Amino acid sequence: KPVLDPKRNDFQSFPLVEKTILTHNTSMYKFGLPHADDVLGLPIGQHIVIKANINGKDITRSYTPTSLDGDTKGNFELLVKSYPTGNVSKMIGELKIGDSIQIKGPRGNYHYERNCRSHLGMIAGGTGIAPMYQIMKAIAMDPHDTTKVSLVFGNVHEEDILLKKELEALVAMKPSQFKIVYYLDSPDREDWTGGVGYITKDVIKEHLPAATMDNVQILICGPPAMVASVRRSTVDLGFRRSKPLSKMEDQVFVF
Ligand SMILES: Cc1cc2nc3c(=O)[nH]c(=O)nc-3n(C[C@H](O)[C@H](O)[C@H](O)COP(=O)(O)OP(=O)(O)OC[C@H]3O[C@@H](n4cnc5c(N)ncnc54)[C@H](O)[C@@H]3O)c2cc1C
Ligand SMILES: [Cl-]
Ligand SMILES: [Cl-]
Ligand SMILES: [Cl-]
């Protein structure tokens, strides 16, 4: 029984049942569903939206749960990074156990289907890993999905990297299908051995599939400066220009 239903296109309330810290500003949040056998019902590629009433406004933002129907019943799980002057993210970071959130879904133009592409090149920064992780996890857990995934995941320093151990476990499931490189612009520590710097044209050319590969797609999600930089790099590398309104058929798709 899926809780999200496009025919009942309204907000619904779900209570916070568990909260686990990932970093000083980021936690995993587990929200309860009405029945122990319920699943969220979120198609792969799509997100939920969460509404907070703040400063006289209904403010809504997109979140991609880390849980899938196939591994999570009776609840759903989100990763949320809170900012000091955030809005919806600040509300979430103020919830106590038992408080509820108002959500609506599913939403989004990315409708992932098994083997719809031969190779996904993923470019993520910060919480932009969330839409990527959902897709890679689905592909990892589907024993008939052969889609190659090459992810370049850029952050400023070590404490900003999210889901690294989870991602590495997905690689270990399909080590011939999945490739991840981590970049840090400015590592804090001398024991970083991943990539150094930000995601440049040269990084994308080295690590992601080329624009000439049949049925390839580039997926992008991150803060606006990263998105503008990497979009320009993909055009310079011969990918088709991402469309103002990203649609699933586009060669470069921005979340
Ligand atoms: C498809 C999609 C999936 C997403 N999934 C997730 C997810 O699973 N988890 C998650 O935590 N977020 C996710 N995001 C990001 C999320 O939608 C919000 O942008 C984020 O939570 C900030 O919302 P806000 O209302 O708190 O801040 P806003 O109202 O957007 O901004 C208010 C202030 O907060 C600060 N701020 C906001 N965003 C940033 C930022 N990126 N870096 C630095 N400061 C910032 C700035 O000071 C800004 O002025 C996703 C976004 C998309 C498009
Ligand atoms: Cl609506
Ligand atoms: Cl939306
Ligand atoms: Cl296109």
Supply φ then ψ for residue 103, to 5 degrees: -130, 155
CA neighbor of 41 nearest in space, from 102, 103, 105: 105
The span from the CA of 171 to the CA of 175, in Å, is 5
Single out the residue of 139, 143, 69, 54 nearest to residue 102, CA to CA.
Answer: 54
Q: Is 116 a catalytic residue?
A: no
Residue 47: other Cβ atoms inside 10 A: 20
CB of 104 closer than 8 Å to CB of 12: yes
Contacts of 187 by beta carbon, 8 Å cutoff, 6+ apart:
157, 158, 196
Nearest Cα neighbor of 42 from 81, 97, 3 is: 3
Tokens of 246: 């990203």
Q: Which residues contact 5 (CB under 8 A, 6 or more apart)?
A: 41
Residue 154 class from Cβ within 10 Å (0-12 exposed, 13-18 middle, 19+ buried)? buried
Q: How far is CA 152 from the centre of its chain?
A: 13
Distances (CA, A) of 243 to 144, 171, 192, 214, 248: 31, 31, 36, 20, 10
Known catalytic membership, residue 63 = yes
Q: Is 47 a catalytic residue?
A: yes
| CB of 124 closer than 6 angstroms to any ligand 1 atom | no
- Positive or negative, the CA dihedral 131, 168, 182, 84 is positive
Phi, psi torsion values for 151, nearest 5 degrees: -115, 130
Catalytic residue (one of 26, 66, 112, 221):
221
Asked if 207 and 119 count as a contact pair (C-beta separation under 8 A), the reply is no
Sign, CA torsion 53/66/234/213? negative
Give the count of beta carbons closer than 10 Å to the beta carbon of residue 230. 28
Residue 112 CA, distance from chain mean position: 13
Is residue 110 part of the annotated active site? The answer reads: no
The experimental resolution of this structure, in angstroms, equals 1.6
How far is it, in rounded angstroms, from Cα 70 to Cα 68?
5
24 contact partners, CB below 8 Å, separation of at least 6: 159
Residue 25 DSSP label: T
How many angstroms is it from 249 CA to the middle of ligand 4?
7
Give CA–CA dist 4/48, Å, rounded: 9
Rg (the chain; Cα; Å): 18
Tell me which residue has its CA closest to atom 33 in ligand 1: 86
Neighbouring residues of the ion ligand 3, judged by CB less than 5 Å: 49, 107
Measured CA to CA, the distance from residue 79 to residue 70 in angstroms comes to 18
Q: How far is CA 87 from the centre of its chain?
A: 19
Number of Cβ atoms within 10 Å of the Cβ of 213: 14
Half-sphere exposure (CA, 13 Å, Cβ side) for 107?
Answer: 17
Residue 50 and residue 141: Cα distance in Å, rounded? 27
CA within 13 Å, CB half, 245: 2
Say if residues 167 and 218 touch (Cβ distance below 8 Å): no
The active-site residue, picked from 63, 112, 182, 183, is 63
Whole-angstrom distance, CA of residue 168 vs CA of residue 166 = 5
Neighbours of 19 (CB within 10 A): 15
The Cα–Cα gap between 180 and 151 comes to: 5
Q: Is the dihedral of CA 243, 152, 221, 201 positive or negative?
A: negative
Which method, experimentally, gave rise to this model? X-ray
- Alpha-carbon distance values, 141 to 144, 146, 148 (Å): 9, 11, 14
Q: Where are the beta strands (DSSP E) in 98-164?
A: 100-107, 119-125, 148-155
The dihedral built from the CA positions of residue 236, 238, 244 and 245, taken in this order, carries a sign that is: negative
Lookup: tokens for 123: 């470019």
Q: Is the CB of 79 under 6 A from ligand 1?
A: yes
Does the annotation place 233 within a ligand binding site?
no
| Distance in angstroms (rounded) separating the CA atoms of residues 209 and 214 | 10
